[PDB]
Design a protein around this ligand. Structure first.
Ligand SMILES: Nc1ncnc2c1ncn2[C@@H]1O[C@H](COP(=O)(O)OP(=O)(O)OP(O)(O)=S)[C@@H](O)[C@H]1O
Ligand SMILES: Nc1ncnc2c1ncn2[C@@H]1O[C@H](COP(=O)(O)OP(=O)(O)OP(O)(O)=S)[C@@H](O)[C@H]1O
Lengths: 684, 66
């Protein structure tokens, strides 16, 4: 007829066990059971942030009607979830949709209030072509319909609160978003379910670490949805790593390599080596099959354990006498003890291993969701990270205080000791020009992301007027670029782990520094469209040169800390104490000596050799040429750039002059031997 | 016809940004309100292929399918 075609039951799917065990939520289940049992305004709608399981509340309502802990007025009801899909999908002719909706309402009236209708996404139903606003409002008025709604907080503002005559036939059953602890409980029930499904065993410290790390690092979505996502995705990872091994991959590639080599050689010895490696391959393959058979038997017996539990729940509802004692005291202790025998057998035989989900796989799925390096240290990465100063002294020579403070900050983030209310670090680099602020920050991005300018580099010398804050926040509502956010918040909400480099910060008007007060205090920055962005995982590096005369005047015969004190007073004269209180540590650079410039000359000549060698020419140098480049490139007030433009002149002008001249032959060695006063190439 | 395959078919939508609001008219279901149930229960194995700025424009304007 009508209530068979277009509606989907929940009480059948709560009876055949197809729905999930819904834990918690007894306050909101009780409030929905209240709102259903009134005389007017009888229809509730569930309104909450998207993800907290409004549909899960109604599925749990069906499970409590079946289990019968409801009051007597709703015992024996039927919950029919409504499908707009088929209803709209059949109506080719005019009025057929209203005919079908009228037929469904007549059969609802004929079922005489015994049916609780569940329309999820009610804002979809409100527009259907009168259509559905003017047709259910009779049954929404006279209390003969017991519709239950479920909608987002967003679409309840638009598609319902537009019209008050449809708005006040409903109730804001405001589903709260659960805290950490209720998320833990929900994950325990669904641990039971997903261990049935993905053939695994979820350790309970992985549940509490999944709850905490889902609350801390993902900030897009809403609990308890993200925690079930991390648990289910890590269980998927473990099922995949079981399903594949890698040792047999090495052995198969080795035996096919030696097989091709032996077939090419047909001294031998490789028949013997191939036979030994194929015996090793067959033994490991049989061990692989034995472990797969063991896990197969264990998960089939656990599935039979759950089928016994569903059958004993059938016996708890129905009430058979000997079936209760039979199922319980026969099936449960023997199956649980040979389950534990199979579990310790897998603890004996899993070598080749992992069939359980600890915290580490949760951390790996979290580090591949967002990008924050949460995971435990594989030893390539840990020895990579202990050599952090050794990784930065190949693109920054000198400047040890900087590399110390920076490497300290990165190490404090990767261990765990960081403060989750701040970014990792927030450095205010000072010092006169051409000593390596900007290349230190590019050295960080080259370490961390394996690319030089793969980082969010904001030029703070565009913000010389007050109205250009809005380039980085974005546009307030009802203006031009409101559809397109900022530049800072968008490119961080994409990739939460980056290095935001504020280029030469002292030029801007002080308002952008007020924006930075928000950022460096609490990692949040509400952009144009009214949403926060989690900056708790970046390294907001800000450069400057506010103490050039002071540092170039007194870095001699003054230690590091007192220099920091005196330049700290100078920056206090240029900034408000709000902003420089927020800073992690102002580190101070210093102008370069002669040997530092010699090393910089060596580095720049290395990249010049790189350029001309990928061109195809090969160049050696005399040490006297390097000494002339060191002596001409030295001056304090302009930093390490007179070295680069002296190199530019005294090599790149005559050398490019002669390479374009058709003179210098490819392949031969271009020797940069000095003249009496200059540097020139020769060819022999 | 994907339910009659029993999880055998990986459905590939290209331009997932397009799908939100495909058919919105006077009497419509918007094509996101017919895949929100089927995607909600995991019965469909859809694979999305969208841009990044099309993702800011089209899907995150609609959190229930985000
Ligand atoms: N308290 C809970 N107990 C058990 N499972 C829950 C709970 N909260 C959420 N879930 C699970 O979360 C998943 C989706 O929950 P839903 O409430 O259906 O999401 P939703 O409310 O439909 O969000 P939208 O905006 O409607 S898509 C299902 O797997 C539920 O079982
Ligand atoms: N300590 C250094 N080690 C290596 N290269 C350096 C060093 N200092 C400067 N350079 C070179 O000089 C350029 C970087 O100069 P920077 O010091 O970054 O200028 P800056 O730090 O922004 O100071 P200002 O604000 O520009 S005056 C690049 O070409 C580098 O190769």
């Amino acid at each position: 007829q009508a209530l068979k075609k277009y509606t989907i039951d929940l009480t059948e799917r709560a009876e055949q066990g197809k729905l999930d065990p819904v834990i918690g939520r007894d306050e909101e289940i009780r409030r929905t059971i209240q709102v259903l049992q009134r005389r007017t305004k009888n229809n509730p709608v569930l309104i909450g942030e998207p993800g907290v399981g409004k549909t899960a509340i109604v599925e749990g309502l069906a499970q409590r009607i079946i289990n019968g802990e409801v009051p007597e007025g709703l015992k024996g009801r039927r919950v029919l979830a409504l499908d707009m899909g088929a209803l709209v999908a059949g109506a080719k002719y005019r009025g057929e949709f209203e005919e079908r909706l009228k037929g469904v309402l007549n059969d609802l009236a004929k079922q005489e209030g015994n049916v609780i209708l569940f329309i999820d996404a009610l804002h979809t139903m409100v527009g259907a072509g009168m259509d559905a606003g003017n047709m259910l409002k009779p049954a929404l008025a006279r209390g003969e319909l017991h519709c239950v709604g479920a909608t987002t907080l967003d679409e309840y503002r638009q598609y319902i609160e537009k019209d008050a005559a449809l708005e006040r036939r409903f109730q804001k059953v405001f589903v709260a978003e659960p805290s950490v602890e209720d998320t833990i409980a929900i994950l325990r029930g669904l641990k039971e379910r997903y261990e049935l499904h993905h053939h695994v065993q979820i350790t309970d410290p992985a549940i509490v670490a999944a709850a905490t790390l889902s609350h801390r690092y993902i900030a897009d979505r809403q609990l308890p949805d993200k925690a079930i996502d991390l648990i289910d995705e890590a269980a998927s990872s473990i099922r995949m790593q079981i399903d594949s091994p890698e040792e047999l991959d090495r052995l198969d590639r080795r035996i096919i390599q030696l097989k091709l080599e032996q077939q090419a050689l047909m001294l031998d010895m490789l028949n013997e080596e191939l036979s030994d490696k194929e015996r090793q391959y067959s033994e490991l393959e049989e061990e692989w099959k034995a472990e797969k058979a063991s896990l197969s038997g264990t998960q089939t017996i656990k599935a039979e354990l759950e089928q016994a539990k569903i059958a004993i729940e059938q016996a708890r509802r129905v009430g058979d006498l000997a079936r209760m004692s039979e199922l319980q005291y026969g099936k449960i202790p023997e199956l649980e003890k040979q389950l534990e025998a199979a579990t310790q057998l897998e603890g004996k035989t899993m070598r080749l291993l992992r069939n359980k989900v600890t915290d580490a796989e949760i951390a790996e799925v979290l580090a591949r969701w967002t990008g924050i390096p949460v995971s435990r240290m594989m030893e390539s990465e840990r020895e990579k990270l202990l050599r952090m100063e050794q990784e930065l002294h190949h693109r920054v020579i000198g400047q040890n205080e900087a590399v110390d403070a920076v490497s300290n900050a990165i190490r404090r983030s990767r261990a765990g000791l960081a403060d989750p209310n701040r970014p990792i670090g927030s450095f205010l680099f000072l010092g006169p020009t051409g000593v390596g602020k900007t290349e230190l920050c590019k050295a960080l991005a080259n370490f961390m992301f394996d690319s030089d300018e793969a980082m969010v580099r904001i030029d703070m010398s565009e913000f010389m007027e007050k109205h250009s804050v809005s380039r980085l926040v974005g546009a307030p509502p009802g203006y031009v670029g409101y559809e397109e956010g900022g530049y800072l918040t968008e490119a961080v909400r994409r990739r939460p782990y980056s290095v935001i480099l504020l280029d030469a910060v002292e030029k801007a008007h002080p308002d952008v520094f007020n924006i930075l007060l928000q950022v460096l205090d609490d990692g949040r920055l509400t952009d144009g469209q009214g949403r926060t962005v989690d900056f708790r995982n970046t390294v907001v590096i800000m450069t400057s040169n506010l103490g050039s005369d002071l540092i170039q005047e007194r870095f001699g015969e003054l230690d590091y800390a007192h220099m920091k004190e005196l330049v700290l007073g100078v920056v206090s004269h240029n900034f408000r104490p709000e902003f420089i209180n927020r800073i992690d540590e102002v580190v101070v650079f210093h102008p370069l000596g002669e040997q530092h410039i010699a090393s910089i000359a060596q580095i720049q000549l290395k990249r010049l050799y790189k350029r001309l060698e990928e061109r195809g020419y090969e160049i050696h140098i005399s040490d006297e040429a390097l000494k002339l480049l060191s002596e001409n490139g030295y001056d304090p007030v302009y930093g390490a750039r007179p070295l680069k433009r002296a190199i530019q002149q005294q090599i790149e002008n005559p050398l490019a002059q002669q390479i374009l001249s058709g003179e210098l032959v490819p392949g031969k060695v271009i020797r940069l031997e000095v003249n009496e006063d200059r540097i020139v190439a020769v060819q022999h | 016809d994907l339910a009659k395959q029993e999880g055998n078919v990986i459905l590939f939508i290209d331009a997932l940004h397009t799908m939100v609001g495909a058919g919105k008219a006077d009497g419509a279901m918007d094509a996101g309100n017919m895949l929100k149930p089927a995607l909600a229960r995991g019965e469909l194995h859809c694979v999305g292929a969208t841009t990044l700025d099309e993702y800011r424009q089209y899907i995150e304007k609609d959190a229930a399918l985000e």
